Amino acid sequence: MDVMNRLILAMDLMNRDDALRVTGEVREYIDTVKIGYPLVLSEGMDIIAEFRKRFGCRIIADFKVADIPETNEKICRATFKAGADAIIVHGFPGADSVRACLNVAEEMGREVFLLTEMSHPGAEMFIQGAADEIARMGVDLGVKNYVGPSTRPERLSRLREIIGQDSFLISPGVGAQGGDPGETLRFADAIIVGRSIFLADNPAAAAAGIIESIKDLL
Amino acid sequence: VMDVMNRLILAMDLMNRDDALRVTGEVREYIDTVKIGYPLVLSEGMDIIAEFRKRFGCRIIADFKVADIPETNEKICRATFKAGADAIIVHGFPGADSVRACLNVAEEMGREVFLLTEMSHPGAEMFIQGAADEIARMGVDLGVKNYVGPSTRPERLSRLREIIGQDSFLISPGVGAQGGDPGETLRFADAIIVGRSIFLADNPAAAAAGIIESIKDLLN
Numbered sequence A: 001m002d003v004m005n006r007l008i009l010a011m012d013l014m015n016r017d018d019a020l021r022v023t024g025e026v027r028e029y030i031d032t033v034k035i036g037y038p039l040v041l042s043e044g045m046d047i048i049a050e051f052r053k054r055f056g057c058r059i060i061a062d063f064k065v066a067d068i069p070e071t072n073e074k075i076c077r078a079t080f081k082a083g084a085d086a087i088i089v090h091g092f093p094g095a096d097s098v099r100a101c102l103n104v105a106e107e108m109g110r111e112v113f114l115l116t117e118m119s120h121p122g123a124e125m126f127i128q129g130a131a132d133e134i135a136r137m138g139v140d141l142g143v144k145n146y147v148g149p150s151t152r153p154e155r156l157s158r159l160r161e162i163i164g165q166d167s168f169l170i171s172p173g174v175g176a177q178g179g180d181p182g183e184t185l186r187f188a189d190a191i192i193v194g195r196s197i198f199l200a201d202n203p204a205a206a207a208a209g210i211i212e213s214i215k216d217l218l
Numbered sequence B: 001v002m003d004v005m006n007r008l009i010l011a012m013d014l015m016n017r018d019d020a021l022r023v024t025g026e027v028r029e030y031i032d033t034v035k036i037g038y039p040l041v042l043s044e045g046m047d048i049i050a051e052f053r054k055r056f057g058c059r060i061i062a063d064f065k066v067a068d069i070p071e072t073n074e075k076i077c078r079a080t081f082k083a084g085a086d087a088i089i090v091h092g093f094p095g096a097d098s099v100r101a102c103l104n105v106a107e108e109m110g111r112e113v114f115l116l117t118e119m120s121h122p123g124a125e126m127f128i129q130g131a132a133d134e135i136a137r138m139g140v141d142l143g144v145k146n147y148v149g150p151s152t153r154p155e156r157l158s159r160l161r162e163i164i165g166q167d168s169f170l171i172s173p174g175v176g177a178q179g180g181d182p183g184e185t186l187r188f189a190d191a192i193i194v195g196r197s198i199f200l201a202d203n204p205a206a207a208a209a210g211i212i213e214s215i216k217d218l219l220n
């Protein structure tokens, strides 16, 4: 996956007008948008096709899929029918649940991203202690795309160690949650950035600023 | 606690609006509580919650297994309650701050959170099972009153009932298609969740009736 400027916009505005406007203002800087449940549940799954129509960007559906295999398969189907290129899946519910997603993605020409460790403080309670094993499970299952935390660079580095340099790794928690763009890109192929861009007075300048700060990494 | 008719909650995971509406309508004499998840919501939109309310008396549990950071969890809960869901199901494994975010929105909006502890499928044994007792204890500490636990592991469902106490409300999936028994499950759970055993039956009404007949002595 070739992410322009190694920067993925997390579009978590809940109003269609704002979401389209802000994305439009930063379109010259990005070609990959992560769309999650805040926007999809507020404006519908049709928003994905609209983004493709307007921007021709790749769409990562950040749905943190975390159900039983039967349900995971249905969620993946509905998601790819809506035009998502990839979907983010939790690893914590185990191998069979991940496999269900892998199977649908294969059938529909899409990718699964496996979320191992999360970026927020609560991740320390249960997820962190399982995260390395979740990553090894990904490797065992043939997963090639991963998500890990900008907020804990040592954990992000460990994730990179486990999955190897050939796997693709994206990382949220940059900006608002305290992660540093450049440090995160020591380990991740791409950074995910939401509020630091879309809540800015001038989202274009915000994106431009981040890119300038990592210019030697591009 | 919500008063679930016949201790039976329909998991409506059909992905076609017409079929989902038809089946739910057919079982309306037996069930007043419907669990709507992402298979249907991602296929037909959040307005489907509205349409169920309009068409049927039913309470709606939004089975969204909320599993994000606190900031995003808050947004998901707000959107979900705005759409008319009575309750939302939230994963506990992402930790206390993530659960608290959902509880705070539910409090502000006058709705309810259900905390998913252990899951019913085989993969649950890999990571979730080992954390499940602590996730449940965390729920109790946070003041969670409603829980979800697995029909497929009676011993685990029993332990989870112990942890949360007799006053907490507990619902349990994995009945029927996944192998759980309705009566055995209701030893510990207040209500059972049933999906495919009902909605894939030639006669969903008859299938619901049959389940209810089998647990008739356990009704209140």
Ligand SMILES: O=c1cc(O)n([C@@H]2O[C@H](COP(=O)(O)O)[C@@H](O)[C@H]2O)c(=O)[nH]1
Pocket (backbone or CB within 6 Å): A010, A012, A036, A062, A115, A117, A118, A119, A120, A147, A148, A149, A172, A173, A174, A175, A176, A177, A192, A193, A194, A195, A196, B068, B069, B072
């Ligand atoms: O561990 C994770 C995994 C995520 O997907 N995310 C997602 O990444 C985005 C981060 O947004 P922000 O840059 O505003 O903090 C949100 O959409 C969030 O749901 C995260 O923050 N931490």
Ligand SMILES: O=c1cc(O)n([C@@H]2O[C@H](COP(=O)(O)O)[C@@H](O)[C@H]2O)c(=O)[nH]1
Pocket (backbone or CB within 6 Å): A067, A068, A071, B011, B013, B037, B063, B118, B119, B120, B121, B148, B149, B150, B173, B174, B175, B176, B177, B178, B193, B194, B195, B196, B197
């Ligand atoms: O541990 C769990 C938690 C669930 O919500 N579920 C949900 O309960 C329902 C079970 O449906 P069924 O009776 O067809 O197996 C599905 O909607 C599924 O997503 C589950 O099966 N196991």
